[PDB]
Design an enzyme around this catalytic site. Structure first.
Site, PDB file in Angstrom:
ATOM      1  N   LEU A  17     -34.657  38.166  49.223  1.00 31.68           N
ATOM      2  CA  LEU A  17     -33.470  37.994  48.389  1.00 31.68           C
ATOM      3  C   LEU A  17     -32.430  39.019  48.834  1.00 31.68           C
ATOM      4  CD1 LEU A  17     -34.885  37.290  44.779  1.00 31.68           C
ATOM      5  CD2 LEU A  17     -33.908  35.630  46.358  1.00 31.68           C
ATOM      6  N   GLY A  18     -32.886  40.228  49.118  1.00 31.56           N
ATOM      7  CA  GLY A  18     -32.028  41.324  49.563  1.00 31.56           C
ATOM      8  C   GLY A  18     -32.812  42.479  50.144  1.00 31.56           C
ATOM      9  N   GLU A  19     -32.163  43.293  50.983  1.00 28.46           N
ATOM     10  CA  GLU A  19     -32.838  44.435  51.584  1.00 28.46           C
ATOM     11  C   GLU A  19     -31.943  45.664  51.567  1.00 28.46           C
ATOM     12  OE1 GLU A  19     -35.675  44.778  55.450  1.00 28.46           O
ATOM     13  OE2 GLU A  19     -33.541  44.862  55.996  1.00 28.46           O
ATOM     14  N   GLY A  20     -32.545  46.801  51.228  1.00 26.03           N
ATOM     15  CA  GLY A  20     -31.890  48.103  51.224  1.00 26.03           C
ATOM     16  C   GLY A  20     -32.411  48.945  52.370  1.00 26.03           C
ATOM     17  N   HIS A  21     -32.109  50.248  52.364  1.00 25.20           N
ATOM     18  CA  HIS A  21     -32.568  51.145  53.426  1.00 25.20           C
ATOM     19  C   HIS A  21     -34.073  51.425  53.355  1.00 25.20           C
ATOM     20  CE1 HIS A  21     -32.517  53.902  56.636  1.00 25.20           C
ATOM     21  NE2 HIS A  21     -32.197  55.036  56.006  1.00 25.20           N
ATOM     22  N   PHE A  22     -34.618  51.581  52.129  1.00 26.29           N
ATOM     23  CA  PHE A  22     -36.020  51.940  51.885  1.00 26.29           C
ATOM     24  C   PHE A  22     -36.916  50.840  51.310  1.00 26.29           C
ATOM     25  CE2 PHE A  22     -33.091  55.530  51.180  1.00 26.29           C
ATOM     26  CZ  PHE A  22     -33.438  56.321  52.255  1.00 26.29           C
ATOM     27  N   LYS A  24     -37.019  46.435  49.457  1.00 22.23           N
ATOM     28  CA  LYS A  24     -36.502  45.070  49.456  1.00 22.23           C
ATOM     29  C   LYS A  24     -36.919  44.306  48.225  1.00 22.23           C
ATOM     30  CE  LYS A  24     -38.009  42.417  52.653  1.00 22.23           C
ATOM     31  NZ  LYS A  24     -38.705  41.618  53.694  1.00 22.23           N
ATOM     32  N   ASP A 129     -26.183  54.185  39.290  1.00 20.25           N
ATOM     33  CA  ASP A 129     -25.911  53.220  40.363  1.00 20.25           C
ATOM     34  C   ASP A 129     -25.312  51.899  39.824  1.00 20.25           C
ATOM     35  OD1 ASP A 129     -26.250  52.604  43.230  1.00 20.25           O
ATOM     36  OD2 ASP A 129     -28.165  51.590  42.839  1.00 20.25           O
TER      37      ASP A 129
HETATM   38  C1  KF1 Z   1     -30.634  43.632  42.053  1.00 19.33           C
HETATM   39  O1  KF1 Z   1     -30.719  43.012  43.333  1.00 19.33           O
HETATM   40  C2  KF1 Z   1     -31.303  43.721  44.353  1.00 19.33           C
HETATM   41  C3  KF1 Z   1     -31.832  44.973  44.215  1.00 19.33           C
HETATM   42  C4  KF1 Z   1     -32.423  45.642  45.310  1.00 19.33           C
HETATM   43  C5  KF1 Z   1     -32.947  46.957  45.203  1.00 19.33           C
HETATM   44  C6  KF1 Z   1     -33.463  47.595  46.300  1.00 19.33           C
HETATM   45  C7  KF1 Z   1     -33.526  46.947  47.530  1.00 19.33           C
HETATM   46  C8  KF1 Z   1     -33.051  45.668  47.669  1.00 19.33           C
HETATM   47  C9  KF1 Z   1     -32.473  44.986  46.569  1.00 19.33           C
HETATM   48  C10 KF1 Z   1     -31.922  43.684  46.680  1.00 19.33           C
HETATM   49  C11 KF1 Z   1     -31.332  43.060  45.602  1.00 19.33           C
HETATM   50  C12 KF1 Z   1     -30.683  41.748  45.827  1.00 19.33           C
HETATM   51  N1  KF1 Z   1     -29.803  41.634  46.833  1.00 19.33           N
HETATM   52  N2  KF1 Z   1     -29.295  40.383  46.772  1.00 19.33           N
HETATM   53  C13 KF1 Z   1     -29.810  39.668  45.767  1.00 19.33           C
HETATM   54  C14 KF1 Z   1     -30.741  40.520  45.122  1.00 19.33           C
HETATM   55  N3  KF1 Z   1     -31.563  40.260  43.988  1.00 19.33           N
HETATM   56  C15 KF1 Z   1     -31.713  39.008  43.439  1.00 19.33           C
HETATM   57  O2  KF1 Z   1     -31.175  37.998  43.911  1.00 19.33           O
HETATM   58  C16 KF1 Z   1     -32.601  38.917  42.250  1.00 19.33           C
HETATM   59  C17 KF1 Z   1     -32.920  37.765  41.504  1.00 19.33           C
HETATM   60  N4  KF1 Z   1     -33.764  38.014  40.510  1.00 19.33           N
HETATM   61  N5  KF1 Z   1     -33.992  39.377  40.584  1.00 19.33           N
HETATM   62  C18 KF1 Z   1     -34.745  40.128  39.709  1.00 19.33           C
HETATM   63  C19 KF1 Z   1     -34.792  41.466  39.911  1.00 19.33           C
HETATM   64  C20 KF1 Z   1     -34.085  42.010  41.005  1.00 19.33           C
HETATM   65  N6  KF1 Z   1     -33.356  41.296  41.859  1.00 19.33           N
HETATM   66  C21 KF1 Z   1     -33.319  39.958  41.621  1.00 19.33           C
END
Ligand code: KF1
Length: 275
Positions: A17-22, A24, A129
């Site tokens: 869904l997404g990736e950070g430095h440390f 995902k 944050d």
């Molecule tokens: C808060 O999003 C991130 C946090 C991060 C925190 C640390 C590392 C990577 C992260 C990536 C995301 C993120 N980036 N792009 C979309 C999303 N997240 C959702 O799409 C998502 C959908 N349900 N869900 C439930 C809990 C947390 N995230 C989600």
């Protein structure tokens, strides 16, 4: 059977869904029946920090609010399991849904962020944050605070938490930048910046980073930022944002934390405008 214990053998990865430095976040299906009918869940894990994730999990496990993402459980190294919100963050959703999200909906989302944040404050936590990337979209009518990676407890009878250890500097209040001090009023400052993002539909060209870099000049960035804030300079009024909305945003940015508006006063302000 513990419903918050997710067995590794049934937790099936679908995609990132997404990736950070440390770490995902991945979309997984918890499928004990093996017929793809199990519930979809969001799974936060670290790249192969561990102590911090365990502190984050214990924070979220004990937060219950309609505008805070729902904790589901753990997979034990450890993985945090949460409800899955398919619309993603405001940063991804808003650019694709301008026609659907008008000023009235942006102000209702603003109220919802403030309610989740006021609750976190009542539980003695400072978020550190708050940005659109951390606000998830449940529906066109509902948002939730979706990450607590930097959240700290403020000691009873104390006003702030001092952080010892990559920071979102363009969302940080002057006390955070100069002294690494995080007050509830510091989260109100970050909220002001997240409101600016929401009102510009998270337009990248007018992001808080892009706008502050134009003011200071495109290791020395933070000093120039602190100087710009001391001079009284602030992010400009978003396009098509009414002055009364921008005035509420400006109250988030009083130099001194003690002079800033509270989340409760912001909620009241937005509700007055929604009438
Ligand atoms: C808060 O999003 C991130 C946090 C991060 C925190 C640390 C590392 C990577 C992260 C990536 C995301 C993120 N980036 N792009 C979309 C999303 N997240 C959702 O799409 C998502 C959908 N349900 N869900 C439930 C809990 C947390 N995230 C989600």
């Amino acid at each position: 059977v513990d419903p918050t214990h997710f067995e590794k053998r049934f937790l099936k990865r679908i995609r990132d869904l997404g990736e950070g430095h440390f770490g995902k976040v991945e979309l997984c299906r918890y499928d004990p029946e093996g017929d793809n009918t199990g519930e979809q869940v969001a799974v936060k894990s670290l790249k192969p920090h561990i102590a911090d994730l365990k502190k984050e999990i214990e924070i979220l496990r004990n937060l219950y609010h309609e505008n805070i993402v729902k904790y589901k459980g753990i997979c034990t190294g450890i993985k945090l399991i949460m409800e899955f919100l398919p619309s993603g963050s405001l940063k991804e959703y808003l650019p694709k849904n301008k026609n659907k999200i008008n000023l009235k909906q942006q102000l209702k989302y603003a109220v919802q962020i403030c309610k989740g944040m006021d609750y976190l404050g009542s539980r003695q936590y400072v978020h550190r944050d708050l940005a659109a990337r951390n606000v998830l979209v449940e529906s066109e009518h509902q948002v939730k605070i979706g990450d607590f990676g930097l959240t700290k407890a403020i000691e009873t009878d104390k006003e702030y938490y001092t952080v010892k250890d990559d920071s979102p500097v363009f969302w940080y209040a002057p006390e955070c930048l100069m002294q690494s001090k995080f007050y509830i009023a510091s989260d109100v400052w970050s909220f002001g910046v997240t409101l600016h993002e929401l009102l510009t539909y998270c337009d990248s060209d007018s992001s808080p980073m892009a706008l502050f870099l134009k003011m200071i000049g495109p290791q020395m960035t933070v000093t120039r930022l602190v100087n710009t804030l001391k001079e009284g300079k602030r992010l400009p009024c978003p396009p098509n944002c009414p002055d009364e909305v921008y005035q509420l945003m400006r109250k988030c940015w009083e130099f001194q934390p003690s002079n800033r508006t509270s989340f409760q006063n912001l909620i009241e302000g937005f509700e007055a405008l929604l009438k």
